[PDB]
A paper describes a structure:
A glucosylglycerate hydrolase (GgH) identified in M. hassiacum and found to be highly conserved among rapidly growing mycobacteria is likely to be responsible for the rapid mobilization of GG accumulated during nitrogen starvation by hydrolysing it to glucose and glycerate. The MhGgH monomer displays an (α/α)6-barrel domain typical of glycoside hydrolase family 63 (GH63), to which MhGgH belongs. While the active site of GH63 members acting on larger substrates is located in an open, solvent-accessible cleft, those of MhGgH and of MgH from T. thermophilus are covered by a cap domain (subdivided into A′- and B′-regions) with constrained access through a narrow negatively charged tunnel. The crystallographic structure of MhGgH revealed a homotetrameric architecture, which is compatible with the oligomeric organization of the enzyme in solution as assessed by SAXS.
To avoid substrate hydrolysis during crystallization or soaking, three catalytically inactive variants of MhGgH were produced. The sequence variations were identified by homology to other characterized MgH enzymes and analysis of the MhGgH–Ser–GOL ternary-complex structure. Two putative catalytic residues (Asp182 and Glu419) and one substrate-interacting residue (Asp43) were identified and replaced by alanine to produce the D43A, D182A and E419A variants. The thermal stability of the D182A and E419A variants was comparable to that of wild-type MhGgH, while that of the D43A variant was slightly lowered (3°C) [Fig. 2(d)].
Author numbering:
A (entry chain B), B (entry chain B), C (entry chain A), D (entry chain A): 2 to 446
The structure:
């Protein structure tokens, strides 16, 4: 009654209870109903959440994801559960099994990608395994033996096929590949996507989340689904997409995560005596994408910009993605101090009306801000976790600690919500969201 | 490496992870492999462990158990999982579905009972639900509406059919009904059980636990299975068992739990406006069994004795069951002080070689003590929990706290072992034992 | 910032820092400025708070108090610090050094008493000492050897000199002896106190606490100080007080504390082989004062009434002292259930406007309620602690737990306030109050 | 009992109780008896430990130290408490009041310096203050206004007067200035110190710590005290010390601490708009002393060497000071990996006989190792803390976490020992050492 929050032990227990409850056997759904399949970057965070519970099962989560890797190295953003419906677009709509030459056999997947947080999950698994003794280390090391090549092929596909011009930024062909479907970042690029005759469909997502203020609009879904038509028309061929896609953007946040992931995987490579050529390529990509991210930045504030490849235009918006350079490093000293002032100030974590000192997905002072509407404003625990972990890696121990503390305070209601209203703290999106439980589990230690 | 123990949050998370992992859907197995079905008093403890995680699912656990209640009110000690093998004796051996007129329809069960800890689980569910607000209170109250009569019929069957002579002690027809299969308590009664021609069988339990030092002997299993033959021969008829059973003992520990359970259920009855006649009967039974327990006690030490009904003999052994009167109250002041001195002294919790200050199942100084052998010596987390909870209810806050603290220290290895070696702390029995995880979850709060 | 509360470790650290900061050497002040001397029941709580930090120093605190015990057994409510000013009435006003035949030599004290919580502090010291090993047990046991007789003389003085008619209730000659100066309990007795020629004085308390809404009025202080004149006029002679005092009340809360303290001290005496005649007397007094408390109770609600000895009338008020019978036991079952319903319902802990689920000193629905005014409404951490500890000793583990949880939530601001505003949680009275820090330290474990 | 360790809250409480117990008013002694005055780098750590308890009192600690700063900027290593005896050499032996032109007025101090950890304490005070709201921020900011210039003069004195040749390393004229009196680092330099006519003296330190195995030898003390005679003979004149001192070493650990402290203080200066010329000088010194540390390093292992200025030779020893480059950064990637391998391997934290995974002051495999003898082997909580904090600032979050976890495990006995036996965990040196309590308080959060 007086305090509906849970203690740290109750919260850790409920988080673990949730993760096991979303386990289908060898894959964990991203949420019970809204996302009843395996999503790529959710699966990485699920592996992080499972590592304190079972290193073996955390490795299983990544093995399942990597078993769905495309022939060319791409990790698709959905690995569909066998016989499960209730998410749209589902496998019939993607038609990758029939159309895509590089699609896996004996797995059904989507035909687009998602950010490469996977190396970070591998590091957390290895860190847990090393505290657990010989048998558990052997599990994690056997996973490295079995999957190091697949991880390399994933990073190599990103570096070679989504950065064809060696600019150090990743090109996306769908806003879904950013992880942030309706971010204001993509609005001006989506405005130039004009659907042709689009085959009939009915959304599933807003049958589960019925409050229209919390999900994208019908007109946005028409553009999301039209881009699918464009990809299917060229049978998901990498070489043909640049010629046909109505949406081609360089995603600076994805690019910064890739830089970090390359550096992380390179250090794993050195510690576990992987091939020197692989380690050298990883360090090369880490520096290439760090530089690519820095090249986008405002010289006064450090804020990173996305780039619309079709319009040949920097995309200037006020979202959390602006803070990409903080994740990967590389900014000059003065510019990074300015970027931190922006982060901590009244446009983001310093905004006087926020319930928690956390990073809203869109600045509350932006014209684009909508406090309930998915990536247009709400506070996302997954981002809080990713920022806190990257900040700790930068050496910003107190900044990381504060994000963790506020994230745990927000999460102490036990809803494990997908995102939270930034002013009232109301849980929004799906409840029982796996990567929110995973963030809590990793934080609580 | 240096410290393989888990933090309170890691331990709570792993305990919850385990409980959900043993969940078959509407019943939780007592262990993954050794006990791959629902056991009656394990199910009560599972409900206690689930209450901090999901009041709804805790209620489901008790609903499933009570759906298997016999027509006469008996709660059987096993509710078998549909299609699951691997425990022996299984349903084919009991043959209750074919033979027992009072057996449930559409559930397969054993033909014997187990201690009535269920009311304690109901109290813990209600206590959790009241901290969680209106909707959760409604779940727990709807369970009371739906199951109060079944709980009454359970207590009434114990009081009327297993205490036919109104002595205030429960008669058992199998040592398995005590929850303590090979306790030294039953050795002299088992010595008078002479098997006839016993149908061939092969144990399953020692295929899973292969160390022979940790389980009962083949000769003990022959007697356990012969008693089954005696019960089947009279088709599990309550009225016929006293005439045919080679094993008839009054179990003072079971009797003390019943007294406590009656008092607990009576208080629930008063708080939730149940029928006055039911509450009055519960208080009557609570006092009858408190007196029955006290009547067994040594006048100098307070230690409670079991009674062999066939031999007409008090059973004097040195096991944790001696402390029955501490659970239910009723001893004169001087005698209870003596009993506490026995508990805290060098024969039990004070023994100088114990790794933890916990109650061994058999006194280490007894000729009967075997440090690995099931109920002949090891320390059982389930007993630690039951003693700590009953002690707190007596008002012995520090004694309860110390048992909890030592139990948590012992459990901090994360094996969730069925029992522990009292000197080395080695985990024994089944790992991943559900009621050990439940004790940890309840303790950690 | 977004949440100014302290973590448990920060709170425990700050509580201990405070207690050591208030240590003058061999006595701890009750607060830094408002109460810059040793008060008797504060000193008991200080000893409880010191026990987790230093058993030696906890023992010193009680040794210092008992060194000021009067020749007849009375423990006076203030032991003044040598050469310290800033509290009024000071030693000159009491004039016990010169007037009181029973006052101690080479300590300056007041001339009235306070509740006998001291045995509870001895129990907590012994419980800590027993967890700390041999040298620490030796310290606590030596304190018992040295002070058991003084503790007996304290209890004997209460039983013989403040319960002259063996009614099982303690008579007070000053409202200050209740520990609750301006409780509504005493208003009708104080209305019959008419000061004669009262020597001029200036208050000190409201120089420190200047907000007039938080302290008693000048008119009340005139009565407090006039009662001192009546005592001085008979030189504090126990035999003459009944003939001259304008204020003579039986305090049912003090009486219930005394019942509990006698039972606690008797159990200590048994455990440490103290003289049997002493233990027998303690148990006799425990039951006499239990019965005396029960005799006062409302036949419907169980609520305990104080008694005005001069007016020969029961004093019916709506304060926390009504709950005296819950501390010591003795109510018939049905009436204790009614009393608990009153405690947990909308007149006390269930009042809908309370910030915390805690017991206000006066019911918010009473015409006497004043949310800021000392004992006329505020929530006192010292009472939360006493009720929680007594409730645990009754066996009401969950009720005790809930009081401790809410008390720790309230105290997490780190002000260690004397009392708190019941609706807003505003800290009131002296900050850095020693017994509030002691409560927190005992709770946090 | 079965486990004498304290819970986190009990430990935090006892640490704070200790720190307040060692408070003389405006300075905290480094220990109760062994070190009954203010030491300079202890005072910095005391301020860190006080910051979670009282930002005001933490600031006072540094104000008291800086009030004893010499005219030339030097912070002396002892500020003597007025009229306190029991440490030798005391103020009479140093004779700085009468001989040293730069000694402060109305403070008594020693005549040598100690490592510049002070900026790290300022950062922790500011970080706490920023979580506590406006009044507390005002206190910390006022301290910066009042003392920024003194902090600059301290850093300037080190950079200009103890690095006269701009080598980026700090020259010591006494092994006591390293904070590590009897480190094997200094043995070959001390072998070239030949006392002349040394005035008679009696040690005080080994009257308190009487076990000869835990303190330096008489022969070492003769050399410590003779160096004082050489300084007094030139009246502590900075310009004359190079011409007369028999001990002149470049201390690479002190140098690395100075690099870190300059970087930390420069960031503070930027954040609080201090003069730009000061910030520029601080960053210049941070990089100069980083480079100076790196220049000393082994080309295979990265291990840092001290330099004997008189012998013009690198000092190669196997102590924790080898790890200086991990604190300040600057090693090439491959050599820093080698240095981390040395730290985590069998010569240091991975030695198989260590009770805790912590850094011994001297390698257990070195011929110089002595497991009880002050800096010749014991594990020092102060160094665990410094390494953990510096490692977190490098971004090595898991390495920092592991040091803190093991440090808290070691400290959970509550002795707050000066140092610990590396194999048995036996507390050694002074108990109730202030900077050990400070480490614990900072860690527990």
């Amino acid at each position: 009654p007086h305090d509906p929050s849970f203690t740290p032990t109750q919260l850790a227990a409920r988080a673990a209870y949730l993760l096991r409850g979303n386990d289908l056997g060898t894959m964990t759904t991203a949420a019970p109903l809204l996302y009843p399949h395996m999503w790529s970057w959710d699966a990485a965070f699920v592996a992080i959440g499972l590592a304190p519970l079972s290193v073996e099962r955390a490795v299983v989560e990544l093995d399942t994801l990597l078993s769905a890797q495309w022939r060319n190295g791409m990790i698709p953003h959905i690995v569909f559960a066998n016989g499960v419906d209730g998410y749209f677009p589902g496998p019939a709509r993607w038609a990758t099994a029939t159309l895509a030459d590089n699609a896996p056999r004996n797995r059904l997947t989507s035909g687009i990608t998602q950010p490469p947080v996977h190396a970070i999950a591998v590091q957390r698994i290895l860190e847990h395994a090393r505290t657990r003794g010989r048998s558990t280390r052997a599990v994690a090391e056997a996973f490295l033996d079995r999957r190091w090549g697949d991880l390399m092929r994933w990073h190599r596909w990103l570096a070679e096929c989504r950065d064809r011009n060696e600019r150090g930024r990743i090109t996306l062909y769908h806003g879904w590949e950013s992880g942030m479907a309706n971010s204001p970042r993509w609005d001006s690029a989506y405005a130039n996507v004009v659907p042709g005759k689009l085959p009939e469909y009915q959304r599933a997502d807003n049958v589960i989340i019925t409050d229209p203020s919390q999900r994208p609009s019908d007109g946005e879904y028409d553009r999301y689904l039209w881009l699918l038509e464009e990809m299917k028309a060229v049978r998901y061929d990498d070489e043909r997409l640049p010629s046909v896609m109505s949406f081609q953007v360089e995603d600076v946040f994805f690019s910064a995560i890739f830089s970090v992931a390359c550096q992380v995987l390179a250090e794993i490579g050195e510690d576990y005596k992987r091939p020197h050529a692989d380690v050298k390529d990883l360090y090369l990509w880490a520096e290439r994408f760090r530089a690519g991210v820095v090249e986008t930045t405002d010289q006064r504030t450090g804020a990173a910009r996305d780039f619309d490849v079709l319009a040949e235009k920097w995309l200037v918006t006020e979202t959390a993605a602006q803070f990409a350079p903080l994740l990967c490093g590389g900014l000059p000293h003065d510019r990074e101090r300015a970027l931190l002032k922006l982060l901590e100030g009244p446009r983001f974590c310093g905004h006087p009306d926020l319930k928690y000192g956390l990073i809203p997905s869109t600045s509350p002072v932006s014209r684009d801000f909508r406090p309930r509407e998915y990536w247009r404003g709400p506070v996302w625990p997954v981002l809080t976790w990713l920022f806190s972990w990257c900040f700790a890696r930068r050496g910003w121990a107190e900044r990381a600690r504060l994000l963790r503390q506020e994230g745990l305070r927000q999460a102490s209601d036990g809803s494990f919500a997908e995102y939270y209203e930034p002013f009232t703290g109301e849980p929004l999106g799906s409840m029982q969201q796996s990567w929110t439980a995973a963030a809590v589990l990793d934080w609580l230690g």
